[PDB]
Design a protein around this ligand. Structure first.
Ligand code: ADN
Length: 259
């Protein structure tokens, strides 16, 4: 845990683009360590109340260590900018992989779900609840293992509703179960190629989520449908435990990874 400066890193190609900031491949000069460096201008941040939100997000991230959670090594700032030192994921985002492939097979989906659940169980133990997870925020390691990247929204709406649970959008207070819903949405999107509540309109998506209106294409197997339906209950209480998800026969049948 030391203070870092831009002089310390050689900066490479951009890994990703974002309005808040851009992510660059970087190499630490002393160790030749390869990593992603995330650059945020203070001003863009200050304009919105993120400045407190970013500091808590950084605080939460630094402490967490899991195979399926993207590591944050450190942070530093320059007169006009904030820089996040992040683990680098060679195989990139699941999002890019999904739009390259268009859908995932059950074996790849089940494996991703299992890794997600494991990562989620670990977060809950630390009293960290995630709330926002989407293929854009999922990264792949050299082994091809899923990693949870952001945490920029972590706790113990003008933005997209696609992955938000009914309780959060309706203004009801929310608990861990919120993550179980996220798992159900992701599992659907992996298999089908689109999130279950996708719509032309924020207002339209609101209603679909609120009513929990989703249908399955023919190719989705009964095993998957059962898992999704359990995950996607309107009442958080009905939603299964992570352990229950890990033990689901469909997960068990098709997963590479352990519970
Ligand atoms: N460590 C990283 N390795 C690879 N791509 C990353 C990394 N951090 C962020 N990104 C990319 O930048 C985007 C913005 O966070 C991500 O969705 C992803 O595409």
């Amino acid at each position: 845990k030391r203070q870092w400066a831009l002089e310390d890193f050689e900066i490479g190609r951009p890994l990703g683009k974002g309005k808040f900031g851009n992510v660059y491949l970087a190499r630490e000069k002393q160790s030749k360590f390869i990593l992603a460096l995330k650059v945020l201008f203070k001003a863009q941040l200050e304009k919105a109340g993120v400045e407190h939100q970013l500091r808590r997000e950084v605080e939460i991230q630094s402490h967490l260590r899991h195979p399926n959670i993207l590591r944050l090594y450190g942070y530093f700032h320059d007169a006009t900018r904030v820089y996040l030192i992040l683990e680098y994921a060679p195989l990139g985002t699941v999002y890019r992989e999904l739009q390259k492939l268009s859908k995932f097979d059950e074996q790849r989906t089940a494996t991703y779900i299992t890794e997600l659940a494991n990562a989620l169980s670990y977060c809950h133990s630390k009293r960290v609840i995630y709330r926002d997870i989407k293929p854009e925020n999922l990264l792949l390691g050299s082994a091809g293992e899923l990693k949870i990247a952001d945490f920029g929204w972590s706790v113990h709406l003008c933005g997209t509703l696609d992955y938000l649970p009914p309780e959060m959008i309706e203004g009801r207070m929310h608990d861990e179960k919120v993550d179980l819903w996220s798992l159900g949405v992701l599992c659907y999107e992996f298999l089908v190629g689109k999130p279950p509540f996708e719509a032309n309109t924020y207002q339209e998506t609101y209603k679909r989520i609120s009513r929990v209106e989703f249908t399955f294409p023919d190719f989705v197997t009964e095993g998957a449908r059962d898992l999704i339906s359990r995950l996607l209950k309107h009442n958080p209480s009905q939603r299964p435990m992570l352990r229950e998800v890990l033990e689901h026969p469909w997960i068990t049948a098709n997963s590479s990874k352990p519970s």
